[PDB]
Symmetry: D2
Subunit: 208 residues, 4 copies
């Protein structure tokens, strides 16, 4: 192992070079995302409370992610939760491949369920565009799952200001693109989710 | 919603400025650590595969983290997993506080079990230093847990090259500090864990 | 307190009776995944010999993709105990199904039951074609079919099949008023037979008797 | 395959018999958390009226702090069904305890059982004083004590107590050779009684008869 030594070297050089010269958002992103949230958003370290998992999921009964959410909402009183996906997501491609990759396959079955849920849409899409579309639909679905948590519903019910957001950044331009699901209440969840799916389901003439 | 608008402005300006101008590590870090791993390690982007949760835990039965680990080891063939803690960890402080914070308290009970495991040590330490020591002990314990997973044990059993590391990022100097648990095998895990705890139990003349 | 004291008295009485008036069946041959409501016990339903059932019970008998607890029961049952039959058993008048369908925030359990609500959505057209007082029991039946489908898609079961291990998956429901086990159609000995039977089962359930419309 | 066909014939036979020869107990009054081994069924052990038990079973009857499955059963039982008694029941000759104690990689289940191994090491001094053939049954007992302790530290149970809701936690073990439920000593109606009873139970288990 030389890569560990290289990492210590780079950390030392960075820290030295730098010295020579209340979080407000919960950010839920993917483990294989290339650009850190803070870089994408030009925020100061500490501004974001960050959870990262494979393919940026909010699975209904994932104690890990739900714990981060409950802590953020009920304890940190964070007012904004952002789910950020990205193009060329290895998690998404892994979910779409037909290989048993072992335990991770069970995690990615939730994504496969989303694929089936939108099977009519994705079936009408030319196969090479399907990954990008799934990546976007996934973000929309994860915001919907987040807004359906007991944690978020309760926060809203008691009058706590809390907004949910779902974006995708394209590795080809670094722009965050809103996928259209934005919730500040259960009604705005339902409406913007339906709206967003309808919009995502309009395919360019690369159909069937 | 101004904070969200600001984020889109920063992102746009960032990506414009930027244009006009195989992961090798699994990095398991804390959701409330402030400096991102990518910056701190000053590596090539995409070099890190990142999981972040509250208090950088590898819980034996956490599907989320174990999935990341299995994926990283069995599929990505990553050779280095690093658990990184950090000083002034809100997760650790939360674990040590006697408040019911709701669901997150269940997540942090694993940390409290670690505190009890090392209760004699921590009790001999002045109260204002205990959070600091628990944070370090926690990293050693999480590396131990990681090395005890079926995934890591199997990887080693079949002769796959895989190392586990446990560091703490020090905010006051930006340096990664090795906590001394470094495992390339079950035997090196046992020894370096025992070695690490023994070293961490030497308290500065600030006893009782 | 009196309920507990009475429980010990019931137990002591039964155990002592047994004495002055299981070990041969060390390894169970069936895994029974069922609901925590435990209306009619599996033993009563099946009249199997003592020890033959390995049992997991959770709210509304779910096999959630990423549930470490259930997946652990399944993996141990299949890879360690070498069980060749897994049965998912639902039941009518299921409190979990009823809670899942109710709008109330019951707290933590709502998150567990969101998986059943997803299933409800997944078959919303069909369930909307049913009379209101028939919907819970249709959702109970559909739930069981979906859980067999989930079980058969686990890495655990698929790997068992892929390496030639004999394993069958079953999904039944009984009416709590009569105790007759009814097969819901999803029965898998392979990924192919899972696909076919799952598809056929949903198609069959979508052909509504006019009583239920 | 014949086993299944037989099972349906048994069922039809029993159900048919019943017809030509539960609904009054729609809400159970006990939560029974026990092992998937299900050696002597809870109904047989307790002789309760049909429907009185709400049952969760998993390998080696664990209450893991972050297990959504068990915690969901517990929260539904406490907050929704308003159950006032939760019982954790272990049993001798537990395959999960035996698997926990063995060094074999059995795959995924090993991760679930790492929690039992943590308990094994937590009480490593005690368990080393026992004769090898007595260790599994001692770990079974300690396991139950520790799971009651975990249950009583859940946010679900602490909140129930905090708000004044009547709730008791129990931890029993039965010998598969005789069916007598034996109380392992951790019994909590409050956080304070949880602590005292937990400490007392471990102390009592630490006082060894003959078997060294
Ligand atoms: Zn990704
Ligand atoms: Zn932290
Ligand atoms: Zn039920
Ligand atoms: Zn057992």
């Amino acid at each position: 192992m030389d890569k560990i030594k290289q990492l210590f070297a780079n950390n030392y050089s960075w820290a030295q070079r730098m010295k020579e010269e209340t979080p407000h958002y919960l950010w839920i992103a993917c483990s294989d995302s290339r650009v850190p949230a803070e870089k994408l958003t030009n925020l100061e370290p500490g501004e974001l409370f960050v959870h990262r998992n494979v393919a940026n999921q909010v699975i209904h009964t994932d104690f890990n992610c739900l714990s981060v959410v409950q802590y953020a909402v009920d304890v940190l009183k964070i007012e904004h939760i952002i789910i950020c996906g990205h193009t060329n997501c290895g998690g998404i491609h892994a979910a779409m491949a037909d290989k048993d990759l072992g335990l991770i396959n069970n995690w990615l079955l939730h994504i496969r369920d989303i694929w089936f849920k939108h099977g009519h849409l994705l079936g009408k899409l030319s196969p090479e565009k399907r990954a990008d579309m799934l990546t976007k639909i996934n973000v929309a679905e994860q915001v919907y799952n987040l807004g359906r948590t007991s944690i978020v519903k309760s926060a809203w019910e008691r009058g706590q200001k809390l907004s949910l957001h779902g974006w995708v950044y394209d590795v080809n331009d670094g722009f965050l693109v809103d996928q259209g699901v934005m919730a500040t209440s259960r009604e705005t969840l339902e409406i913007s989710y339906r709206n967003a799916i309808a919009r995502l389901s309009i395919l360019d003439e690369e159909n069937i």
